[PDB]
Coordinates of C-alpha atoms and ligand atoms in Angstrom, one line a residue:
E1 CA -45.3 28.0 10.9
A2 CA -47.6 30.5 12.4
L3 CA -49.9 29.0 9.7
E4 CA -51.1 26.7 12.6
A5 CA -52.7 29.9 14.2
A6 CA -54.4 30.7 11.1
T7 CA -55.7 27.2 10.4
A8 CA -56.8 26.8 14.0
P9 CA -60.2 28.8 13.6
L10 CA -61.2 26.3 10.9
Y11 CA -62.2 24.0 13.8
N12 CA -64.3 26.4 15.8
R13 CA -65.1 29.9 14.7
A14 CA -65.6 29.0 11.1
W15 CA -68.5 26.7 12.1
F16 CA -70.0 28.8 14.8
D17 CA -73.1 30.2 13.0
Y18 CA -74.0 26.7 12.0
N19 CA -73.2 25.1 15.4
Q20 CA -74.7 27.9 17.4
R21 CA -78.2 26.3 17.1
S22 CA -79.4 25.4 13.6
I23 CA -77.3 22.2 13.6
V24 CA -79.8 20.7 16.1
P25 CA -83.2 21.2 14.3
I26 CA -81.7 20.5 10.9
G27 CA -79.2 17.7 11.5
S28 CA -81.3 15.8 14.2
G29 CA -84.8 17.3 14.3
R30 CA -85.5 16.8 10.6
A31 CA -84.5 13.2 11.0
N32 CA -87.0 13.0 13.8
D33 CA -84.4 12.0 16.3
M34 CA -86.3 14.1 18.8
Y35 CA -89.1 16.6 19.0
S36 CA -90.9 19.6 20.6
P37 CA -94.0 21.4 19.6
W38 CA -92.4 24.6 21.1
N39 CA -88.8 24.1 19.8
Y40 CA -88.9 24.4 16.0
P41 CA -91.4 21.5 15.2
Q42 CA -91.6 22.5 11.7
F43 CA -88.3 20.7 10.7
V44 CA -89.8 17.5 12.1
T45 CA -93.2 17.9 10.5
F46 CA -91.9 19.4 7.2
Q47 CA -93.5 22.8 7.5
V48 CA -90.3 24.9 7.2
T49 CA -90.6 28.1 5.3
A50 CA -88.0 30.2 3.5
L51 CA -88.1 32.7 6.3
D52 CA -86.9 30.2 8.9
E53 CA -84.0 31.6 11.0
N54 CA -82.3 28.2 11.3
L55 CA -82.0 28.1 7.5
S56 CA -80.4 31.5 7.6
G57 CA -78.1 30.5 10.4
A58 CA -77.1 27.1 8.9
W59 CA -76.6 28.7 5.4
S60 CA -74.3 31.5 6.7
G61 CA -72.4 29.1 8.9
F62 CA -71.5 26.7 6.0
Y63 CA -70.5 29.6 3.8
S64 CA -68.5 31.1 6.7
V65 CA -66.5 27.8 6.7
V66 CA -66.1 28.2 2.8
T67 CA -64.9 31.9 3.1
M68 CA -62.3 31.1 5.8
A69 CA -61.0 28.0 3.9
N70 CA -60.6 30.2 0.8
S71 CA -58.8 33.0 2.9
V72 CA -56.5 30.4 4.3
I73 CA -55.7 28.7 0.9
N74 CA -55.0 32.2 -0.5
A75 CA -53.1 33.3 2.6
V76 CA -50.8 30.3 2.0
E77 CA -49.7 32.4 -1.0
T78 CA -49.7 35.7 1.0
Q79 CA -47.1 34.0 3.3
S80 CA -41.9 25.7 4.5
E81 CA -43.4 23.4 1.8
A82 CA -44.8 20.9 4.3
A83 CA -46.4 23.4 6.6
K84 CA -48.1 24.9 3.6
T85 CA -49.6 21.8 2.1
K86 CA -50.9 20.8 5.5
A87 CA -52.5 24.2 6.0
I88 CA -54.2 24.1 2.6
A89 CA -55.2 20.4 3.3
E90 CA -57.0 21.5 6.4
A91 CA -58.8 24.4 4.7
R92 CA -60.0 22.2 1.8
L93 CA -61.2 19.4 4.2
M94 CA -63.4 21.8 6.0
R95 CA -64.5 23.2 2.7
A96 CA -65.4 19.6 1.6
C97 CA -67.3 19.0 4.8
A98 CA -69.3 22.3 4.6
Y99 CA -70.4 21.5 1.1
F100 CA -71.1 17.8 1.8
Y101 CA -73.5 19.1 4.5
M102 CA -75.1 21.7 2.2
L103 CA -75.4 19.1 -0.6
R104 CA -77.7 17.0 1.7
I105 CA -79.8 19.9 2.9
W106 CA -80.4 22.1 -0.2
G107 CA -78.9 20.1 -3.0
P108 CA -77.6 22.5 -5.6
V109 CA -75.5 25.3 -3.9
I110 CA -73.0 28.0 -5.0
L111 CA -69.3 26.7 -5.4
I112 CA -66.8 29.2 -4.3
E113 CA -63.1 28.8 -4.7
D114 CA -62.5 32.7 -4.6
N115 CA -64.2 35.0 -2.1
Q116 CA -64.2 38.1 -4.3
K117 CA -64.6 40.3 -1.2
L118 CA -64.6 43.4 -3.5
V119 CA -68.2 42.7 -4.2
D120 CA -70.5 42.7 -1.2
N121 CA -73.3 40.6 -2.9
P122 CA -72.1 38.8 -6.0
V123 CA -74.6 37.3 -8.4
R124 CA -73.5 33.7 -8.6
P125 CA -75.4 30.7 -9.9
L126 CA -76.3 27.5 -8.2
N127 CA -74.1 24.6 -9.4
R128 CA -75.4 21.0 -10.2
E129 CA -75.4 18.4 -7.5
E130 CA -73.0 16.3 -9.6
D131 CA -70.6 19.3 -9.6
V132 CA -70.8 19.8 -5.9
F133 CA -69.8 16.1 -5.4
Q134 CA -66.9 16.6 -7.8
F135 CA -65.8 19.7 -5.9
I136 CA -66.0 17.9 -2.6
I137 CA -64.0 15.1 -3.9
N138 CA -61.3 17.3 -5.4
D139 CA -60.9 18.8 -1.9
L140 CA -60.8 15.5 -0.2
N141 CA -58.2 13.9 -2.5
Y142 CA -55.9 16.8 -1.8
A143 CA -56.5 16.4 1.9
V144 CA -55.8 12.6 1.7
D145 CA -52.4 13.2 0.1
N146 CA -51.3 16.1 2.2
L147 CA -52.5 15.4 5.8
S148 CA -50.4 13.3 8.0
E149 CA -51.2 9.9 9.4
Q150 CA -51.1 11.1 13.0
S151 CA -51.4 14.4 14.6
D152 CA -52.0 16.6 17.6
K153 CA -55.2 16.1 19.6
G154 CA -57.9 17.9 17.7
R155 CA -56.3 18.3 14.2
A156 CA -57.2 16.4 11.1
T157 CA -55.5 13.4 9.8
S158 CA -55.4 11.7 6.4
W159 CA -57.5 9.0 8.1
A160 CA -60.3 11.6 8.5
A161 CA -60.0 12.7 4.9
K162 CA -60.2 9.1 3.8
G163 CA -63.1 8.6 6.2
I164 CA -65.2 11.5 4.7
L165 CA -64.2 10.6 1.2
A166 CA -65.6 7.0 1.8
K167 CA -69.0 8.6 2.9
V168 CA -69.1 10.8 0.0
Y169 CA -68.4 8.1 -2.6
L170 CA -71.1 6.0 -0.9
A171 CA -73.6 8.9 -1.0
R172 CA -72.9 9.5 -4.6
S173 CA -73.1 5.9 -5.5
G174 CA -76.9 5.8 -5.6
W175 CA -77.6 9.6 -5.9
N176 CA -80.1 10.2 -8.8
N177 CA -78.8 6.9 -10.3
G178 CA -82.0 5.3 -11.3
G179 CA -82.4 2.8 -8.5
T180 CA -78.9 1.3 -8.3
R181 CA -75.7 2.2 -6.6
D182 CA -72.8 2.9 -8.9
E183 CA -70.3 0.0 -8.6
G184 CA -67.3 2.2 -9.3
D185 CA -68.2 4.4 -6.3
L186 CA -69.1 1.5 -4.1
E187 CA -65.6 0.1 -4.8
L188 CA -64.0 3.5 -4.1
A189 CA -66.0 3.7 -0.9
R190 CA -65.0 0.2 0.1
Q191 CA -61.3 0.9 -0.3
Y192 CA -61.1 4.3 1.4
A193 CA -63.2 2.9 4.3
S194 CA -61.4 -0.5 4.6
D195 CA -58.0 1.4 4.5
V196 CA -59.1 3.3 7.6
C197 CA -60.7 0.3 9.2
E198 CA -57.8 -2.1 8.7
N199 CA -54.8 0.3 8.7
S200 CA -55.4 3.3 10.9
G201 CA -54.7 1.4 14.0
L202 CA -57.7 3.1 15.6
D203 CA -60.3 1.4 17.7
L204 CA -63.7 2.2 19.0
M205 CA -63.9 3.5 22.5
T206 CA -64.7 0.5 24.7
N207 CA -67.7 2.2 26.1
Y208 CA -70.2 4.0 23.8
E209 CA -71.2 6.4 26.6
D210 CA -67.5 7.5 27.0
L211 CA -67.6 9.3 23.6
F212 CA -69.9 12.0 25.0
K213 CA -68.0 13.0 28.1
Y214 CA -65.8 16.2 28.3
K215 CA -62.8 14.3 29.5
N216 CA -62.7 12.4 26.3
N217 CA -62.6 15.1 23.7
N218 CA -60.4 14.0 20.8
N219 CA -60.3 10.4 21.8
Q220 CA -59.0 7.9 19.1
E221 CA -62.5 7.4 17.8
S222 CA -62.8 11.1 17.1
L223 CA -61.5 11.5 13.5
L224 CA -62.8 15.1 13.0
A225 CA -64.6 17.2 15.4
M226 CA -65.4 21.0 16.1
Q227 CA -62.8 22.0 18.7
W228 CA -64.7 24.2 21.0
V229 CA -63.0 26.4 23.7
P230 CA -64.0 25.4 27.2
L231 CA -66.0 28.4 28.6
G232 CA -64.9 30.0 25.4
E233 CA -65.6 33.5 24.4
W234 CA -68.4 34.1 21.8
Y235 CA -67.7 32.8 18.2
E236 CA -65.6 30.0 19.8
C237 CA -67.7 28.3 22.4
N238 CA -70.3 25.5 22.0
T239 CA -73.6 27.3 22.7
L240 CA -75.8 24.2 22.4
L241 CA -75.9 23.5 26.1
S242 CA -79.1 25.4 27.1
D243 CA -80.9 24.2 24.0
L244 CA -80.2 20.6 24.7
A245 CA -80.7 20.5 28.5
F246 CA -84.2 20.0 29.9
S247 CA -83.7 20.9 33.5
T248 CA -81.2 22.5 35.8
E249 CA -81.1 19.3 37.9
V250 CA -78.9 17.9 35.1
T251 CA -76.7 21.0 34.6
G252 CA -75.4 21.6 38.0
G253 CA -77.8 24.6 38.3
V254 CA -76.9 26.2 35.0
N255 CA -79.8 27.9 33.0
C256 CA -81.4 25.9 30.3
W257 CA -84.7 25.4 28.6
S258 CA -84.9 22.5 26.2
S259 CA -88.4 21.1 25.7
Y260 CA -87.1 18.5 23.2
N261 CA -88.1 14.8 23.7
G262 CA -86.8 11.7 22.0
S263 CA -89.4 10.8 19.5
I264 CA -91.6 7.9 19.7
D265 CA -90.2 6.7 16.4
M266 CA -86.5 7.2 17.4
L267 CA -87.0 5.4 20.8
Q268 CA -88.6 2.6 18.9
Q269 CA -85.4 2.0 17.0
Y270 CA -83.5 0.8 20.0
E271 CA -83.6 -3.1 20.3
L272 CA -84.5 -4.3 23.7
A273 CA -80.8 -5.0 24.5
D274 CA -79.5 -1.7 23.2
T275 CA -79.8 0.4 26.4
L276 CA -76.2 1.6 26.5
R277 CA -76.7 3.7 23.4
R278 CA -80.2 4.5 24.2
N279 CA -79.2 5.7 27.8
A280 CA -76.3 7.7 26.5
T281 CA -78.7 9.5 24.0
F282 CA -81.9 10.1 25.9
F283 CA -83.1 10.0 29.5
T284 CA -86.0 7.5 30.0
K285 CA -87.7 6.5 33.3
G286 CA -85.4 4.7 35.7
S287 CA -82.3 5.3 33.6
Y288 CA -79.3 5.7 36.0
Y289 CA -76.1 7.8 35.4
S290 CA -73.1 7.5 37.7
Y291 CA -71.2 10.4 35.9
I292 CA -74.0 12.9 36.2
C293 CA -74.7 14.5 39.6
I294 CA -71.7 12.8 41.0
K295 CA -72.1 14.8 44.2
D296 CA -75.4 13.0 45.0
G297 CA -74.4 9.5 44.0
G298 CA -75.4 9.9 40.4
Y299 CA -78.7 11.1 38.6
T300 CA -81.7 8.9 38.0
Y301 CA -84.3 10.3 35.7
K302 CA -87.8 9.7 37.1
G303 CA -90.0 11.4 34.6
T304 CA -92.2 10.0 31.9
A305 CA -90.7 11.7 28.9
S306 CA -87.5 11.4 26.9
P307 CA -85.3 14.5 27.2
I308 CA -81.8 14.6 25.6
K309 CA -78.8 13.1 27.4
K310 CA -76.4 13.4 24.6
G311 CA -74.9 16.9 24.5
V312 CA -75.9 17.3 28.2
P313 CA -72.5 16.6 30.0
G314 CA -74.0 17.3 33.4
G315 CA -73.0 19.9 35.9
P316 CA -69.7 21.8 36.0
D317 CA -68.6 19.6 38.9
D318 CA -69.5 16.4 37.0
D319 CA -66.0 15.8 35.8
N320 CA -66.2 18.8 33.5
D321 CA -63.7 20.8 35.4
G322 CA -66.1 23.7 35.9
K323 CA -66.5 24.4 32.2
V324 CA -70.3 24.4 32.0
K325 CA -72.3 27.6 31.8
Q326 CA -75.4 28.7 29.9
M327 CA -74.8 28.5 26.1
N328 CA -71.3 27.2 26.9
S329 CA -70.8 23.4 26.6
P330 CA -67.3 21.9 26.8
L331 CA -68.0 19.0 24.4
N332 CA -66.7 18.9 20.9
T333 CA -69.2 18.7 18.1
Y334 CA -68.5 15.4 16.3
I335 CA -68.2 15.6 12.5
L336 CA -66.8 12.0 11.9
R337 CA -66.4 9.1 14.3
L338 CA -64.6 5.8 13.4
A339 CA -67.9 4.0 14.0
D340 CA -69.3 5.9 11.0
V341 CA -66.5 4.6 9.0
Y342 CA -67.2 1.0 10.1
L343 CA -70.9 1.3 9.1
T344 CA -70.0 3.0 5.9
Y345 CA -67.6 0.2 5.0
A346 CA -70.5 -2.2 5.7
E347 CA -73.0 -0.3 3.6
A348 CA -70.5 -0.1 0.8
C349 CA -70.0 -3.9 1.0
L350 CA -73.8 -4.6 0.9
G351 CA -73.8 -2.5 -2.3
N352 CA -76.6 -3.7 -4.6
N353 CA -77.3 -7.0 -2.8
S354 CA -80.3 -7.7 -0.7
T355 CA -78.1 -9.1 2.1
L356 CA -74.5 -9.2 3.4
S357 CA -73.5 -12.5 5.1
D358 CA -69.8 -12.2 5.1
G359 CA -66.6 -10.3 4.8
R360 CA -64.7 -7.7 6.5
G361 CA -67.6 -5.1 5.9
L362 CA -69.9 -7.3 8.0
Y363 CA -67.0 -7.6 10.6
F364 CA -66.8 -3.9 11.1
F365 CA -70.6 -3.6 11.3
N366 CA -70.8 -6.2 14.2
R367 CA -67.9 -4.6 15.7
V368 CA -70.2 -1.6 16.3
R369 CA -72.9 -3.7 17.7
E370 CA -70.3 -5.5 19.9
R371 CA -69.6 -2.2 21.6
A372 CA -73.2 -1.5 22.2
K373 CA -73.0 -4.8 24.0
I374 CA -75.7 -6.3 21.9
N375 CA -75.8 -9.4 19.8
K376 CA -74.0 -9.6 16.5
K377 CA -76.0 -10.1 13.3
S378 CA -75.0 -13.0 11.0
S379 CA -76.3 -11.2 8.0
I380 CA -77.7 -7.7 7.3
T381 CA -79.8 -5.7 4.9
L382 CA -80.1 -2.0 4.0
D383 CA -82.9 -1.7 6.6
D384 CA -80.7 -3.0 9.3
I385 CA -77.9 -0.6 8.4
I386 CA -80.4 2.4 8.4
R387 CA -81.5 1.3 11.8
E388 CA -78.0 0.8 13.1
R389 CA -77.0 4.2 11.8
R390 CA -80.0 5.9 13.6
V391 CA -79.3 4.5 17.1
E392 CA -75.5 4.8 16.8
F393 CA -75.6 8.5 15.9
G394 CA -78.9 9.7 17.5
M395 CA -78.7 13.3 18.6
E396 CA -75.3 13.8 16.8
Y397 CA -77.0 16.0 14.2
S398 CA -76.3 13.7 11.3
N399 CA -79.2 11.3 10.8
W400 CA -81.1 13.8 8.4
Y401 CA -78.1 14.0 6.1
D402 CA -78.0 10.3 5.7
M403 CA -81.7 10.1 5.1
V404 CA -81.4 12.6 2.3
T405 CA -78.7 10.5 0.8
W406 CA -81.0 7.5 1.0
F407 CA -83.9 9.5 -0.5
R408 CA -81.6 10.4 -3.4
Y409 CA -81.0 6.6 -3.8
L410 CA -84.4 5.2 -3.2
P411 CA -86.9 8.0 -3.3
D412 CA -90.2 6.2 -3.0
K413 CA -88.8 3.8 -0.3
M414 CA -87.7 6.7 1.9
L415 CA -90.8 8.9 1.3
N416 CA -92.9 6.0 2.6
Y417 CA -90.4 5.8 5.5
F418 CA -90.7 9.5 6.2
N419 CA -94.4 9.2 6.3
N420 CA -94.3 6.4 8.9
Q421 CA -92.2 7.9 11.6
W422 CA -95.2 9.3 13.7
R423 CA -93.7 12.6 12.9
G424 CA -95.2 15.3 15.2
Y425 CA -96.8 12.7 17.4
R426 CA -96.2 12.7 21.0
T427 CA -97.5 10.8 24.1
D428 CA -98.1 11.9 27.8
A429 CA -96.1 9.0 29.2
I430 CA -93.2 6.9 28.1
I431 CA -93.0 4.0 30.7
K432 CA -90.5 1.1 30.9
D433 CA -90.8 -2.7 31.2
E434 CA -88.4 -5.5 31.9
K435 CA -89.0 -2.5 27.1
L436 CA -90.6 0.8 26.2
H437 CA -94.4 1.6 26.1
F438 CA -96.0 4.7 24.6
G439 CA -99.2 6.2 25.8
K440 CA -100.8 7.8 28.8
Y441 CA -102.8 6.9 32.0
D442 CA -106.5 7.8 32.2
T443 CA -107.8 7.3 35.7
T444 CA -104.0 2.1 34.4
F445 CA -102.1 2.4 31.1
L446 CA -103.5 3.1 27.7
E447 CA -101.1 1.9 25.0
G448 CA -100.5 2.7 21.4
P449 CA -101.2 5.3 18.5
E450 CA -104.9 5.8 19.6
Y451 CA -103.6 7.4 22.7
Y452 CA -100.8 9.6 21.1
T453 CA -101.1 13.3 21.0
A454 CA -101.6 13.8 17.1
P455 CA -100.6 16.9 15.1
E456 CA -103.5 18.9 13.9
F457 CA -102.4 20.1 10.4
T458 CA -101.6 18.1 7.1
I459 CA -98.5 16.0 7.0
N460 CA -98.1 14.3 3.7
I461 CA -94.5 14.3 2.9
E462 CA -93.6 14.4 -0.8
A463 CA -90.5 14.6 -2.9
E464 CA -90.5 18.4 -3.1
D465 CA -90.5 18.7 0.7
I466 CA -87.2 16.9 1.3
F467 CA -84.6 19.5 0.3
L468 CA -85.2 22.6 2.3
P469 CA -85.6 26.0 0.5
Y470 CA -82.9 28.6 0.1
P471 CA -83.1 31.3 2.9
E472 CA -85.3 34.1 1.5
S473 CA -82.9 36.9 2.4
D474 CA -80.2 35.4 0.3
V475 CA -82.6 34.8 -2.5
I476 CA -83.5 38.4 -2.6
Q477 CA -79.8 39.3 -2.8
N478 CA -79.1 36.7 -5.5
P479 CA -82.0 35.9 -7.7
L480 CA -80.1 33.0 -9.4
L481 CA -81.0 31.1 -6.3
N482 CA -84.4 30.6 -7.9
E483 CA -83.0 29.6 -11.2
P484 CA -81.8 26.2 -12.5
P485 CA -78.2 25.2 -11.5
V486 CA -75.4 25.5 -14.0
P487 CA -72.3 23.4 -14.7
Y488 CA -69.2 24.5 -12.8
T489 CA -66.0 24.9 -14.8
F490 CA -63.3 23.1 -12.9
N491 CA -59.9 24.4 -12.9
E492 CA -57.6 22.3 -15.2
Ligands
LIG1 O1 -100.1 25.0 26.0 C1 -100.7 24.0 26.7 C2 -99.5 23.2 27.3 O2 -98.3 24.0 27.5 C3 -97.1 23.3 28.1 O3 -96.0 24.2 28.1 C4 -95.0 24.6 27.1 C5 -95.5 26.0 26.7 O4 -96.7 26.1 26.0 C6 -94.4 26.6 25.8 O5 -94.6 28.0 25.9 C7 -92.9 26.4 26.1 O6 -92.1 27.1 25.3 C8 -90.8 27.5 25.9 C9 -89.8 26.7 25.2 O7 -89.9 25.3 25.3 C10 -88.4 27.1 25.7 O8 -87.4 26.3 25.1 C11 -88.2 28.6 25.4 O9 -87.3 29.2 25.9 C12 -86.6 30.4 25.4 C13 -86.2 31.2 26.7 O10 -87.3 31.7 27.4 C14 -85.4 32.3 26.2 O11 -84.7 32.9 27.4 C15 -84.2 31.9 25.3 O12 -83.5 33.1 25.0 C16 -82.1 33.0 24.4 C17 -82.1 32.9 23.0 O13 -82.9 31.9 22.5 C18 -80.7 32.9 22.5 O14 -80.9 32.8 21.1 C19 -80.0 34.1 22.9 O15 -78.6 34.2 22.6 C20 -78.0 35.5 22.5 C21 -77.2 35.7 23.6 O16 -77.9 35.8 24.8 C22 -76.3 36.9 23.6 O17 -75.3 36.7 24.6 C23 -75.6 37.1 22.2 O18 -74.5 38.2 22.4 C24 -73.1 38.2 22.0 C25 -73.0 39.0 20.9 O19 -74.0 38.6 19.8 C26 -71.7 39.1 20.3 O20 -71.7 40.0 19.2 C27 -70.6 39.5 21.4 O21 -69.5 39.3 21.0 O22 -70.8 38.6 22.6 C28 -72.3 38.6 23.1 C29 -72.2 37.7 24.3 O23 -71.0 38.0 25.0 O24 -76.7 36.9 21.1 C30 -77.3 35.7 21.2 C31 -78.4 35.6 20.0 O25 -77.6 35.8 18.8 O26 -80.0 34.0 24.4 C32 -81.4 34.2 24.9 C33 -81.4 34.4 26.4 O27 -80.3 34.9 26.9 C34 -79.8 35.7 28.0 O28 -79.6 37.0 28.1 C35 -80.8 37.8 28.1 C36 -81.4 37.4 29.5 O29 -82.7 38.1 29.5 C37 -81.7 35.9 29.6 O30 -82.1 35.6 30.9 C38 -80.3 35.3 29.4 O31 -80.6 33.8 29.3 O32 -84.8 31.2 24.2 C39 -85.5 30.1 24.6 C40 -86.0 29.3 23.4 O33 -85.1 29.6 22.2 C41 -85.0 29.6 20.8 O34 -85.6 28.4 20.3 C42 -87.0 28.5 20.5 C43 -87.6 29.7 19.7 O35 -89.0 29.8 20.0 C44 -86.9 31.0 20.1 O36 -87.3 32.0 19.2 C45 -85.4 30.8 20.0 O37 -84.8 32.0 20.5 O38 -89.3 29.4 26.1 C46 -90.6 28.9 25.7 C47 -91.7 29.6 26.5 O39 -91.3 30.8 27.0 O40 -92.8 24.9 26.6 C48 -93.7 24.7 27.6 C49 -93.2 23.3 28.4 O41 -92.0 23.4 28.9 C50 -97.5 22.5 29.3 O42 -96.6 21.7 29.8 C51 -98.8 21.7 29.1 O43 -99.3 21.1 30.4 C52 -99.9 22.5 28.6 O44 -101.1 21.6 28.3
CL2 CL1 -89.9 21.4 5.2
NA3 NA1 -98.0 7.1 7.7

């Protein structure tokens, strides 16, 4: 039971190459959560090339998770029967997560149970999307059975396993399935998600803004998160700080450079009453914050833009216990929140119906709206769920993965949706009412699209743009990355 020391880096170092940076433009930028012409716009505008350094970063990161999980699983043979099944359960959970991410970025990817290690650059084929689902599910089922129902602050539980496995079943339900969601998968998703919702004994944090404070790492709503070391050494700190934060006035002096702004389209998703989630995600004019710049009575953003609040914990003195320096944020990276399980339950209860007007699924939906301190809905559609998921998880680097899942379910719907997100548009001044307005002054406020700063190249998003390309460097090393995927031969 020094396994625990070997399974520990599965939460931090394993994910580092991914989390270092790429996680933001890919997870949140390609969803058009937010935007900058000078910080990797191409992900927002669908102009990404095979040479893109974020693709390389992300791709190595996820496979680093895979390598380490496989090292551990193997290592559990190169070294108590309950300590061992737990260790393997953690490795395979992370391995499922890494692939479930890749599956919704590239689609086909290479399925590796065995690292080889003797061969620097193995020539392995891509495996089919359905095989990648079945691999992820094999891993999650093991983690469901072999993780415990409660654990130490920061470690995985069987509730997390069930949580993920509910999202996976929901995502497979409609994937390439000819316009309908598979009822078998919908039922599987309902039962894993309702079992978490009803039996975990867990509860949403009363205040949504609390989720995103250092002092609240591994709260009861955090089912699975990247456990970053406060002021950690390289390979084990959260380096996203300087990329997220727009000005030193919100970092207690620490160096930063973010030019990201919440997108027109993203800011428009927030209902008029939904300002607790909006505030906790982006700064907008007038927005007050008691827990940032605590020394000066709190910070009030007084600009006309939409810089990122979420992932910007404030200064080292702003209840962060001094754990804030450049490229060193003390926040965990969320992977799965209980809120996500609530919405996932809901979507799985909607199923193939137009509307959902009753049941426990709608209860856990409204339960999320309840926390945002906004009005419940008496019935919901898929479009409500999409919108609720966007505002709930804005700037948590996961809205793109969901949009890919949806695109895989209703491709023409979502292509029309991607093309009506004002992608690449921006506006001089976002001003606030008594309600958000988008435009500019000109010598008096000019409102609407006509006064947006429009992109000046072609943006016509089509099916082949959605999944990103394989990183060119890897393609050169393994030419099968250009060939059709093949069926994986599963192990029994
Ligand atoms: O035009 C009209 C219009 O204009 C408007 O204005 C615009 C303007 O036009 C536009 O130019 C502008 O653009 C900005 C942009 O918005 C901004 O974000 C960007 O900033 C960059 C910074 O300048 C730059 O310093 C920063 O550098 C960091 C790297 O990005 C980062 O990857 C790197 O990390 C290193 C790490 O440092 C190192 O420690 C590490 O070492 C490890 C080692 O690897 C281990 O092996 C070992 O174990 O441990 C070691 C550590 O212990 O390796 C990492 C990389 O792998 O860190 C650097 C900086 O780091 C530090 O050290 C070096 C010191 O010199 C430095 O001081 C110190 O910080 O990158 C920023 C952007 O980053 C990334 O994303 C963007 C992309 O382009 C980059 O390629 C990418 O790197 O700057 C530009 C401009 O310069 O926006 C303007 C508006 O704001 C007007 O407003 C309008 O009116 C006009 O009309
Ligand atoms: Cl693209
Ligand atoms: Na359009």
